[PDB]
């Protein structure tokens, strides 16, 4: 019943999807059964920034930053699974959390 | 009916009629009616003399008209005599609780005074 739960967070959805696909392929190569990746709801933060140095209240730039989240479940892990997942390299811009 | 020296309306519900007395609001009216035992939807004109006396007994337990106006007058006069900041505002007929006076002080000031 040793289930490995992997949570991925990123600011770039292409990066997060590539990382999730690589993780899933790495697990399937070893031969475990995997569930996902499952896309969690995205967080969107918005900001209103004045563009003029002194006085133009209606002249603003609107920015946003999104946080994408993926969930992966690994069940019936082979002994090689944990070692391969730990040996997997850390891609920049993606945060990976593993819970046993 | 005459209660506490004033003639409250007779054709209204008791809980609304009792608010015509100075110093008695809706909450106090409901308190008095509950303490006496009279329902709030009963009209004044359909109450008997014993119930009126019972209501008068409860009304006598709170400051209503002359005592309350006297107390408020003394409270303001004490500040004006002491000369604190609130007393000065009362003397000058200006807002007392920190509101702006550059604009919007007409309740305290009265109608606009042309220059």
């Amino acid at each position: 019943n040793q289930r490995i739960r992997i949570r991925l967070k990123s600011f770039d959805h292409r990066l997060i999807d590539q990382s999730a696909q690589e993780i899933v392929e790495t697990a399937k190569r070893t031969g475990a059964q995997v569930c996902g990746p499952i896309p969690m709801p995205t967080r969107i933060e918005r900001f209103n920034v004045l563009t003029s140095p002194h006085v133009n209240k209606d002249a603003r730039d609107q920015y946003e930053i999104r946080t994408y989240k993926r969930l992966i479940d690994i069940v019936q892990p082979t002994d090689k699974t944990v070692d391969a997942l730990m040996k997997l390299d850390l891609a920049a811009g993606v945060d990976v959390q593993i819970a046993l | 009916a005459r209660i506490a020296g004033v003639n409250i309306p007779d054709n209204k519900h008791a809980v609304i009629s009792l608010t015509y007395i100075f110093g008695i609001g809706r909450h106090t009216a409901k308190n008095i009616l509950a303490a006496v035992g009279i329902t709030e939807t009963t009209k004044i004109r359909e109450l008997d003399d014993a119930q009126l006396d019972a209501i008068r007994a409860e009304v006598a337990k709170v400051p209503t008209e002359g005592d309350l106006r006297r107390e408020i007058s003394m409270n303001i006069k004490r500040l004006m005599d002491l000369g604190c900041y609130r007393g000065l505002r009362h003397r000058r007929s200006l807002p007392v609780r920190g509101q702006r006076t550059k604009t919007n002080a007409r309740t305290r000031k009265g109608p606009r005074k042309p220059i």
């Binding site: 600011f11 770039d12 933060e45 918005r46 900001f47 920034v49 004045l50 563009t51 140095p53 730039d61 609107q62 920015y63 946003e64 930053i65 999104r66 811009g93 | -």
Partner: protein, 100 residues
Amino acid sequence: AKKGMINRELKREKTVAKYAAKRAELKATIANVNASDEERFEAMLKLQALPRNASPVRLRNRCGLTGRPHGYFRKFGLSRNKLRDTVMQGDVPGVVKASW
């Protein structure tokens, strides 16, 4: 901002950092029911006897680059003028122009 104002904020931050533990202990003792009323009163006097700059309500968030005291955006630690410039040239990861 003037350099004196920045040094003033630095000094206040250092004082807040220095007096953090004693202030927390004093407030805990104040809020401690089991302590006697005399002990709570003494703790209140001790807390009132601390230097003013020990209190954190006198800290003002300033831009990490210029020291501007208006328009802070806690998330980036930069005032709006520097935030616009740094965002629009690509130095802030994940932030893009928002349209919806």
